[model samples]
Target chain A: SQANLMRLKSDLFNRSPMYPGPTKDDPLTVTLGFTLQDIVKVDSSTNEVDLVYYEQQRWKLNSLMWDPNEYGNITDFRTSAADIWTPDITAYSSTRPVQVLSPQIAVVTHDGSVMFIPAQRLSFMCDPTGVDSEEGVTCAVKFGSWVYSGFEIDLKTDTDQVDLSSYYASSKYEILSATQTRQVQHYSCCPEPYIDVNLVVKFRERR
Target chain B: SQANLMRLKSDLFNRSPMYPGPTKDDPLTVTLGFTLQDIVKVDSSTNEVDLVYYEQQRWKLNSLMWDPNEYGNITDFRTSAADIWTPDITAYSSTRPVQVLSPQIAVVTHDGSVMFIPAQRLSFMCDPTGVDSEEGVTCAVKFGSWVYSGFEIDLKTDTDQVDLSSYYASSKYEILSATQTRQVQHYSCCPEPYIDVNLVVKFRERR
Candidate 1:
């Protein structure tokens, strides 16, 4: 048995078996191709920020050196801020509450403006003008005619959502400053707004 | 004449026509917006690195301080390396040899890889495998069969192009060590190949 196993090993390693190489008759060849990724945008005017986003741009050749699911963990790279809005995506493993990466939300306004907000930060008050809070969860939110400086509390249930809308109508909202689009965001080399350049080169080895 | 035009000196000094800021109606309503610039890629297995790039990311609020043409000058930012691939956009004025802003080229390779290459610096050997040369433009270009260590030598004329290709076919090409793609470039906020997050905030006086 030992002699037979040894013989088998020698044959395989020495290319005495299924050989994958080049010879005078046949030559090695290669194919060249490329893939593109989508893009995302964010705006903070009109109470709601109209934006587009892309999740995959960096082409991940997963099986290169590290095996799939080894080093490309998103959670390990997500945001650390407790109150910023982060990117939402399905995790590699089964989990709940959703995983967030980069908790910083780029807030763009109508006027010449730029600012960053933590996705979950809020300034809660029972009354729009008066300082009052029952559960201590309120930010500068747009309640009817009122505007909260920081407001993005999660509506856990159906009733909470209803109460929140009603509260805005009855509350007093001050005249927060308004702004218009000063500089619109754009991207070149991408398909949506700006067209950017993309090029490629290739090689083929044959006998 | 000098005294008359001097405006008897603004009690505090400084106030010229090209004065950068402060206009009425537009109460310096600081609007903030961030644009994400796409990242570059590179691979080295092949002598000439194949790649892709993105230029515009941050949309500038041009009218902030300096006049449009006077301030957005590339000489203020192009990479200093005498030999490196840089961005060449149409100029705002009639100038010789277009000015570039960022002279770094994002080189992406077939092995799921990427890196930036200085536009101008190149090792040019007329023989492709022998010594190098002096005054010549270069990029990671492929000509016929032979490959340079960093094939970016500029093919200036029609005759040069033909000669360059002929040189490659008769030269000796070696198999360089290969590298696998490390991380598959992915993004969540912005579109281009690399995921860059951009944002803005602002305030305007309302009626």
Candidate 2:
């Protein structure tokens, strides 16, 4: 049982690449400060592009309805629908949020370390050793069927005022094994974390 | 009938304080970006800022499923479990895509003077455009259905590599309209026909 567990973990992640690395054809390039524009369909034979706005509209209803035949939306990117674990809050690191700027996200795991098991204060997350809490909150992002295992984007830090260096790794994301990500930007006061962190896997592609 | 239809559309969109516009409570200060994106929560009652991370796990048998009701391992978030939609392909985007640099996006809409519907002579976007179709592909994203919709962070561009500035209204995201959202941070080349777009609505302490 012991070895079997280890083997399972290793197999799940052993072959995982470093964030989103480049291979032979897919040369590695860190993405930063960008958003998705639209969905396009390419002719597999002629290699033409078709803007998929109307198509997206037609299919939105598919996503609007709960998977009447499925389990939950989180685990179902296949069907293009979304749902939440709780009726009120979003799942951990949800790609979909109820609010934009400051969404309520929580994670509880042997891995995540948010300062103070239950204490709340300013200069928080400033706690040196990093904090892990048992009485923390949780969202569905940590444990849902996600867009991808890793999404590495090259971003700038010259702007904004948020500290990102030290994070209270979610028990779920702790094992994600993500390294530092940066780009053509930076800022002072607190520099590691920049903004809007909704990492997700995508089904779109490059021509 | 035309006047009535116009009025209905007006009520849904116009006659309102610009959708996505910041208000007395929240102001769009730091733009939601590719990397270093932040997530915050504001208690509508006390206006308290809860610096917490949201995380949760879900299961989907198909594109129409939720996880909690099925597995019950999760309680706080999983409202009901159902699954739908199966993923055709899964991939990662440039986590840190730069919007200012090389600006890899071409917008398309129902109205296009110049057909920017770009086909990838270069593999820039997630998919190529600029071509007509035979069967017309089907594609869609999850919005608000316990899957993904409002209060999310993402951006995107058109799939084509042409210029049709007139085709698109200057890119200004009003926090009010949700229909404008077209894509999230895929970091790949955006698809074409960028009728609607998504934004990473941010907040700030306004004057």
Candidate 3:
């Protein structure tokens, strides 16, 4: 069974599957979402909010699909993200380089669906005036494909609300609201529009 | 023709060809060599020598072999080193992290012979007493597989002499001699022996 799995990996890695979609004309739809793990720090001096969370990206590669029955009934496997084509989504509003806390692993299904969840520590600039107020300070982090336009990669959110099932209560702040929003904007340099998914978080100081 | 090449890449990458040899029992032989590019700097205070060179590693992967006649008659192609299995050879005597100046590209041939030449800046500790003497100071840099033993990988050298065809003579120093040597040693940690290839360079300050 393990031999069969190895064979599948060799077969998949040999192919030049640069485009995730079935054809060049088809746009690959990527579902982007994040699960808040903790509000690590709130730097009022720099008006910055630091968060540790898991960023999830889900997409499909038609060429990667295989019949599980032929391969010892294997349904899915975890491999290095560099082994396959992955969406180059970057945080547009990040204050510093995104720090990945976990291994970059991609879970590949028999049907060619791939899920990548990377634990990251991200910092975003926000208003410091609302840090201790009842209304709380709001921070929005925008993520979009750094190179691909909307015509090639369509960005979507799985839900309008941020996933907070594993959120840890911060000692210095309390969550007020968390939401997800999608926006498409046309740029002057490109003929196609670019899509971005924004994650908004509002929290107030714990008095 | 390029499309066919893409298909060939897809086919090769899908299979798990971890073992470079034709069979698991056979040890894969890798030829390791380096070309002296330049003597960047010599720090007498630290007794260190900085050099810019091109490290060349050549190996054959039986599984990577293809019929060129079928795929546009392509003789060879260059692809990212991450796309395939590569030897994890490291400089055992490096003073700092090896700095690669060129893109990590692997040239793959129809016969499955792969050549990877990475331009790197390497530093090594040496005796500075011979810095301005008639007899130059000797510096030896050793390279070997960090994990694989001789049982799995057999290291070899193409020549006993260091390549100086493209060497750029440094104004501060003149090269007196250059040589290469391969050694195999047994360690207490494992039953198998490990292979190492050492490049020796001797140089003295220009009068």
TM-score of chain A of each: 0.14, 0.16, 0.91
Greater-TM-score candidate between 2 and 3: 3
Model 2 spans > 4 angstroms off: A1-207, B1-96, B102-179, B182-207
On lDDT, the candidate that comes out on top is 3
User: For residues A48-125, what per-residue lDDT tens digits would candidate 3 score against the true structure?
Assistant: 578898989999877778998878889999899988877767765454446789999999999999999989997654
- Score every model by TM-score: 0.15, 0.15, 0.51
TM-score of chain B of each: 0.14, 0.17, 0.90
Model 1 scores a TM of 0.15
lDDT rank order = 3, 2, 1
Candidate 2 residue A70 Cα shift, in angstroms, is 47
Ranked by DockQ, top first: 3, 2, 1
Superior candidate under TM-score, 1 versus 3: 3
Better model by DockQ: candidate 1 vs candidate 2: 2
Give lDDT: candidate 3, residue A184: 91
> How far is A110's C-alpha from truth in model 2 (Å)?
19
Query: Each candidate: what lDDT?
Result: 0.19, 0.21, 0.76
Which lDDT tens digits does candidate 1 get at residues A1-207?
222222322322344333332322432111111111100111122221111111121111111112213322211111112222222211122112321211232321122121222211111212222112222212222111011111111111111111111111111121122111111124565332211111111111111
Task: Score candidate 3 by TM-score against the native.
Answer: 0.51
Instruction: Write the residue-wise lDDT of candidate 1 on B17-76 in tens digits.
Output: 111111121111111111112112111211111111122211112221222233233112
